[PDB]
Design a protein around this ligand. Structure first.
Ligand SMILES: O=C(O)C1(c2ccc(Cl)cc2)CCC1
Lengths: 237, 300
């Protein structure tokens, strides 16, 4: 059910829509056992649910206890995601419920369709573009609240901080995807770009530094440089 | 044995009677079909020599009345009719037999194919899928659409099969989303078997009737119905042993009887690979899997 760039504009219109990313829902470390076999240990995950227009992020924290005594966890994760998303929709006032939900992976179409049977007018469709939402765990404040969680927890963020006071949603989401793409390609260097100048800080209620318009241009350029490089490093070009 | 006489054959047409068929030439002196085995439903079906468009035909049971065929030159097709005058009908049949203008239903005494394809099919049920209550027989043709097809335009000429949809509230219990979608046993046994069909014989009868309309008329909606009903059983982890064993027999003969030349349009590759190789019942259709592999290994 995936479209082309043609309507990058459908994103930022006035129809309420949410992006659902399940990459970080089911997360493991793989290790050797005393007997020299391999075992996984689960760590906390999250559902990344984002309104691209408003920047609102509904970060559903998935505690490791949800997997206890369950089989086929990677398949269960997709259904747990669909259940949480449906619960979120049901918890919103009607006028705030999305008209459509965009899954970033095609394996979520059926778990979500089934959980949303009660909402026939909410269109479920997947991307066939490449969105970097899996890098949301590279954002320090987001990573921190997931790892510290002792129980299931829903934490609300604005992933655009205050940008919308100054730029459009279109630009705001292009900056976010460029920041996330950079973080995904070379986290260390991306984080170096963002903090090298200690005079530019991160407000306690923000996720990203308080760059001026001028400083955002420079930053965005450095992130583009980064991605282009890593592309060279990787492919030898 | 019973008889379906023909008033005449004014236009050239290939006539089918169950899985048998013979060519009749424009105004050849053809007057019907005799020795039709009592105890089974049957289908007499037609493809005009001049317009292969619209295969069409009639489901009937000779125990339910005296039936004849009459070409209608206004509507342009062979029409089944009932003769209520019993004395008149015996009279007509005896004269046509005496003049030997009837073909004999050519059953081979060792052959159980028709029974094996119509085991669970009953006229009373056919007449509920094909609603035209003034007639004791039922008309079907290539183009008739199903109730589910019209939902996604004339309901008088629809095929009223049981709607099956794996992503519906009917199929999916609130709170059991993942469970009921990956193991459809609830949907099969409680919703459909216990709720709608009442027993497995009525389920298999619709199954077989859907297959037969798909094959004899290339009715696409019927084909969709046949595949759906197989997939529901095969995707159910919990099915009565007797249902599994019968289903293997049902499907084996359907596969056995299917014209090879039609295998590319009437068999859904996805459903069959799923049923035979990925589903809960992957190991429970030995006969059906052996003939699918030996006859159509290309689909798989
Ligand atoms: O083309 C795509 O995949 C993207 C998309 C997704 C949903 C809508 Cl409504 C419109 C554009 C563009 C970012 C993902």
């Amino acid at each position: 059910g995936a479209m082309n760039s043609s309507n990058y504009a459908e994103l930022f219109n006035n129809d309420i829509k949410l992006f659902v990313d399940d990459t970080n829902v089911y997360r493991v470390t793989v290790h050797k056992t005393f007997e020299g076999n391999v075992a996984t240990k689960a760590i906390n995950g999250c559902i990344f649910t984002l309104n691209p227009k408003t920047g609102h992020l509904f970060l559903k924290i998935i505690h490791t206890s949800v997997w206890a005594g369950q089989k086929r966890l990677s398949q269960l994760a997709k259904w747990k995601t669909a259940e949480e998303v449906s619960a979120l929709v049901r918890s919103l006032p009607k006028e705030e419920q999305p008209k459509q939900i965009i899954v970033t992976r095609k394996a979520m179409l059926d778990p979500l369709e089934v959980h949303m049977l009660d909402f026939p007018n909410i269109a479920i469709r997947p991307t066939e573009l490449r969105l970097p939402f899996s890098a949301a765990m590279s954002i320090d404040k987001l990573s921190d609240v997931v790892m510290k969680a002792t129980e299931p927890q829903m934490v609300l963020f604005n992933i655009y901080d205050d940008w919308l006071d100054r730029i459009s949603s279109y630009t705001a989401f292009s900056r976010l995807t460029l920041l996330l793409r950079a973080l995904k390609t070379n986290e260390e260097s991306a984080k170096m770009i963002l903090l090298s100048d200690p005079t530019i800080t991160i407000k306690s209620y923000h996720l990203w530094p308080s760059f001026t318009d001028e400083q955002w241009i420079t930053i965005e350029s450095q992130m583009r440089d980064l991605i282009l490089t890593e592309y060279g490093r990787k492919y030898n070009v | 044995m019973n008889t379906v006489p023909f008033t005449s054959a004014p236009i050239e047409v290939t006539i089918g009677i169950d899985q048998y068929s013979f060519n009749v030439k424009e105004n050849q002196p053809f007057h019907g079909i005799k020795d039709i085995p009592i105890g089974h439903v049957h289908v007499i079906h037609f493809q005009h020599a001049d317009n292969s468009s619209m295969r069409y035909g009639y489901w009937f049971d000779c125990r339910m009345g005296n039936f004849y065929i009459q070409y209608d030159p206004k509507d342009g097709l062979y029409k089944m009719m009932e003769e209520r005058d019993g004395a008149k009908f015996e009279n007509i049949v005896h004269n046509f037999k005496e003049r030997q203008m009837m073909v004999s239903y050519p059953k081979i005494d060792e052959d159980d194919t028709w029974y094996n394809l119509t085991e669970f099919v009953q006229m009373d049920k056919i007449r509920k899928i094909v609603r035209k209550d003034e007639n004791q027989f039922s008309y079907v043709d290539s183009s008739m659409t199903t109730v589910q097809e019209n939902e996604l335009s004339d309901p008088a000429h629809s095929l009223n099969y049981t709607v099956i949809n794996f992503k519906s509230r009917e199929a999916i219990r609130p709170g059991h989303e993942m469970e009921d979608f990956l193991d459809k046993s609830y949907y099969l046994n409680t919703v459909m078997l216990q709720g709608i069909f009442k027993n497995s014989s009525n389920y298999f009868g619709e199954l077989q009737f859907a297959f037969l309309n798909a094959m004899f008329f290339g009715n696409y909606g019927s084909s969709l119905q046949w595949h759906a009903m197989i997939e529901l059983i095969c995707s159910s982890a919990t099915v009565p042993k007797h249902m599994l064993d019968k289903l293997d027999e049902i499907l084996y003969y359907q596969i056995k009887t299917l014209p090879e030349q039609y295998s590319d349009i009437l068999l859904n590759e996805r459903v069959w690979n799923i049923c035979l190789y990925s589903s809960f019942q992957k190991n429970s259709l030995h006969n059906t899997e052996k003939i699918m592999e030996n006859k159509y290994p290309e689909l798989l």
